[PDB]
Design a protein around this ligand. Sequence first.
Ligand SMILES: Cc1cc2nc3c(=O)[nH]c(=O)nc-3n(C[C@H](O)[C@H](O)[C@H](O)COP(=O)(O)OP(=O)(O)OC[C@H]3O[C@@H](n4cnc5c(N)ncnc54)[C@H](O)[C@@H]3O)c2cc1C
Length: 447
Amino acid sequence: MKVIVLGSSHGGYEAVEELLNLHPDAEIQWYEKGDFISFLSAGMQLYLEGKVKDVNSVRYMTGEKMESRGVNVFSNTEITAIQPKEHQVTVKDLVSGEERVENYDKLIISPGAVPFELDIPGKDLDNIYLMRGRQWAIKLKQKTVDPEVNNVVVIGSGYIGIEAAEAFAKAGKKVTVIDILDRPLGVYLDKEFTDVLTEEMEANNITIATGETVERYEGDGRVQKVVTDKNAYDADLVVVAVGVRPNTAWLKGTLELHPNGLIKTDEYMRTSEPDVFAVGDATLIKYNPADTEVNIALATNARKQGRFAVKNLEEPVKPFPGVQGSSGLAVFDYKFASTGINEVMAQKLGKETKAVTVVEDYLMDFNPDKQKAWFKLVYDPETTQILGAQLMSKADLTANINAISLAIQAKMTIEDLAYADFFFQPAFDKPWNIINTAALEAVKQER
Ligand SMILES: Cc1cc2nc3c(=O)[nH]c(=O)nc-3n(C[C@H](O)[C@H](O)[C@H](O)COP(=O)(O)OP(=O)(O)OC[C@H]3O[C@@H](n4cnc5c(N)ncnc54)[C@H](O)[C@@H]3O)c2cc1C
């Protein structure tokens, strides 16, 4: 059986891993149009902050290692088109210019996504940077030590924008974050959490300019000003982290796509055409909190989809279990994690919810290491089933969100979590831990 896998990132990589243990016998070709196999864009912040010194070690696989396992790796080779009926792809070797047609028995594609750019006046004056991949990582790192860069503006206040804002504020630069949305990180956290984080960022000289539409970049040759409908900001560097666009335009007319460019797939990762599977940021995934399909562009999602595509290679036998959208990050001293439905998700999906937020020390009063922790539990008003949770503290309590992700998947209720058995030892927690305490509050609220 000959299987071709497109993409060396999270989705494509895991499909190769599951093929190696489920179909050791197969001829496997792995294609990457880029020069570098499996660079980890998630590790970019650690590199930019100087935690990791070698940009080339921020990866999880090399072509050499895969070839030792019998995989045919083709870097600098792009799959230009798919001919689904006759089961062929045309590939182009980007270093020699040679094209060729390759046949396959099964095709798994994980084409990914590309940074969204603002198509506005000034669009590409110099020093308007993006944040994805090895080349952008290197360029961003050189700007971190440049004495000419004094003011940097990042557009977008989501996960990637706040990572870039923290990295340049730690490098000693003045940062302004601009967005149309009213709160940074609203897709991940609710207002009681983002109010605390806004203060922490402002204490580290990051200005957050919310509710402003960027209209043009101004500058002579290189960017010098970012002007919005409401203001003008000096900028020596702009990082655009507004969002991501599916890399699927080349597939229009070949595979069925959603209006927004996402590939249509079912619960077995099958596309509209026989024997081609699609995985990763370019697809929608089953979202268990609301029993619907949502696009959640995370490495965890792409890796699970990748393995499920190989499981369903010959027969639709293993439907995808679904996910909860779990994410976590540190912003200066605060470490937060969240899963399931929050206010922005509930609004987008038209979902009614109830919630309780508990803010108190996570260790007993006599223990001098005690610190404040914020925990919000979101539940369904009719069934009281768990729908989401968010937590934050300067102490790392993030592994507790893993228990809430399972609770949502299992359809547990506030009563189940109020009395769930979690260990107690006073150097680690209180007799009723952070999850028990918030659920106990919800039980009182619903009496
Ligand atoms: C700065 C940053 C930080 C992130 N941090 C986290 C995090 O901490 N936790 C988390 O879970 N997720 C994180 N993510 C998200 C995560 O990186 C993505 O969800 C994941 O990489 C998606 O994998 P993918 O295979 O779908 O696509 P992509 O990563 O977009 O990879 C697509 C690959 O296929 C190649 N390709 C595309 N078309 C072709 C073609 N036609 N022929 C051959 N090759 C082709 C591309 O060159 C690319 O290498 C982060 C993303 C960024 C940018």
